[PDB]
């Protein structure tokens, strides 16, 4: 609702200052492109953005952001690109990413190939390595795959 | 991962087929690439990410792999394709590179023209004396020059260089320079250079007397 | 041998603190991975968190990061979960966990107690004669007003340990004493009852210097 | 994000009936692996199933539990006595280690209603060596819960201790209750234990003496 | 667009160490990482080490783990390598390359840095005519040339008859002599019947030493 501000009073959250009518109105929630701005009567009319475009903060911009298209013939998505997020890539299934970047670490690395007699702590496939520590028999350990923990 | 190049000088004819066998020590899965370098030119990437051809690269080059003995193929061969060819993995933090390759055209064999050249009196005034032997319009590049001074073989006092392939007649040329001191030069009489080439059934020796 | 030995029962009052020394044995010390685990009385298994003593890196669970404190020494074959602001709810047998093993030892018997470390009052109840006429035997050993829960009760018949025939229950008296009472019954048949000819009940607790054995016999 | 929540919380079954258990999981039962566990009352837990189908090395294979998807399972033919326990769902192959929430396998016995058999428990040597005689009655072989016991119809309650009931191997409950009194009062006054078993609508009062 | 261009050849007394500048442009500096692989002529590419621009991570190659210095300047978009105490062995061709995407592949390359290590002095070459064989002037074809010796640095530009003779001329690449100076040969094959008539001169120009010599070639007497 177009609630009028008064001198020495701050407009509440989710309302900014709209200068076209000099009156603060409600802010559309993240996931919206303000297509009509505030007037003396008309509040901000919310409407969702298109695909592969978003806004991560309660916005009034008439244009939405842009996520990526694909990471590679490999490098599947570990996080989809919806209306409230970005296409967070990974460095292919069964490969650990040891470097870092905004999403795509410039260097990935093979998941691991450590011999029977190594126990892979945890992949940390997003930003870490599986590691390989002895567990030499463990319960049953006679496989070189290293994709699996000490199990048979 | 020590990436290598099993082929460093191939034999091929124009519009033929051949395969490079870039070899590694550990597997890289889809982490192979392809680099071609004409002599004196900044290397170019040919194929990257297994078989994914680099943007704006001639089609004739094709291949891929997922193991450790990677191989691609070339369908059509042109004279411009003669160059340095190597690879480099994307596996772990120690990137390496193959040793390189050198495509070499196999056309008709041309015998070299051999000439030996005495030093000059202007060089006689300077206190140093050098002799040279000339190889002209020969093919293939493989040639051997043995320098004889009073029939004594020299080693480590001669240097040679080979010109690149001619664009008009596709031959090669080699020049070897033998460098000696003045007392060493004036104490010897017969200077000869022996040239062995596949285009010559027997080695060809050109000689001159110091006097 | 592969085990998790730690410090014995310690009666620290709420708000106090004490280190708890895990003692890996048998297996290589390794000390890149070391977790601890604890369980409140008849609660669910909660995971304290892990650490990297060799590489000096700490990875606890988000829940218990406030209490997160542990160190270890590579030479000593020993690990130490420092712990602060102990509360009676933390009272448990703390197994010094770790991945690569997924096996837990005797558990650090935690003894966060509010009352004094008292001794149990021990009594023996011979079975009723009509109970003997019924064909079964039921001897009862009583422990009265002790603290905390942790006590060992076992049977000596012909001065030999008895197992596989016992059953126990305990009570809570939070009104005045805040102490604890255990009722242990041992069941035998009549034939064994008169052939054995002697019986005793021995009880071990933190609150007394040495275990007491007090026996009864017909006559 | 890490969440493990057991499915049917309480299992009570008799000898023979199979087993149904589950943990709802977000990421780890099918591709990413978890663990089965088991803890007996007040002791160190143990690993039963390791690769969601791989049982512990060297153990009977009655644990036919190999669930997958986002919700796994356990099944057991002819549930034994040791089988009665709690069980846990792990979430390994993840950054924070986490455990399950337990599934109590109560062993049903199919008991029948029966009145209590109260017996007197006389003091002989306990009063001399302690200065206070603990007195009580043995309420044995009753079913089902609950039974109420009072001392001398509630005459005194200073030192009366009433224990919780426990289940026998025959499917019936056993219960004791005790009270502590000095020997001087033991010698003179009469002591009666009054117990009331309302499920059977039966009540017995038993005299106890030195 | 990881454009990579590199500096030319450098020469310094052995013992000192120079810091290179592999200037790059056409792509955000942090989002790309520039490695260090040198191309010593006759030696395959050997990787000196790699440096992270954005996160400043570094992993010097174990061969060069200590002696190399993979520094860089953020503003100039340039990695600065210093190879401590440049030796004649370290004197070579240096390259820097990078990648555009997330799994590395050297889609781009540098122009090729060069480095030379010696204690020589810029010196002009002396030109010596190469007299044709006297007893071969009737063999149909004969050759003559001039010798270029003891100059520093490259290159020397040679021509025949002030550029009027371009048929059959082979100008070979230089070779580094043990004394520390370069040497090369210039030749021309000519009809042997014109040896006593046609005057043959070769023009040798060495811009670094500003030395120009015109040298006539005649058969010996």
Residue numbers in the entry:
A (entry chain A): 8 to 159
B (entry chain C): 2 to 212
C (entry chain D): 1 to 219
D (entry chain E): 1 to 210
E (entry chain B): 1 to 221
List sentences from the manuscript.
The original agonistic BpAb formed crosslinked complexes with TNFR2, but the insertion of four GP linkers resulted in the formation of a stable 1:1 complex with antagonistic function. The tertiary structure of the 1:1 BA1-GP4–TNFR2 complex was successfully obtained by cryo-EM single-particle analysis. No densities corresponding to the linker, fragment crystallizable (Fc) domain, or MBP were observed. Most of the CRD4 in TNFR2 was not clearly observed. The TNFR2-bound structure of 96-Fab was newly determined in this study. Notably, 92-Fab and 96-Fab bound to TNFR2 at approximately the same position along the long axis of TNFR2, and their paratopes faced each other in a 180° orientation. The distance between the C-termini of the two Fabs is ca. 15 nm, which needs to be connected by long linkers. The observation was in contrast to the complex with BA1-GP4, where 96-Fab and 92-Fab were bound at almost the same positions along the long axis of TNFR2, and minimal push-and-pull motion was observed.
The extracellular region of TNFR2 comprises of four cysteine-rich domains (CRDs). Various peptide linkers were introduced into the hinge regions of IgG-like agonist BpAbs against tumor necrosis factor receptor 2.
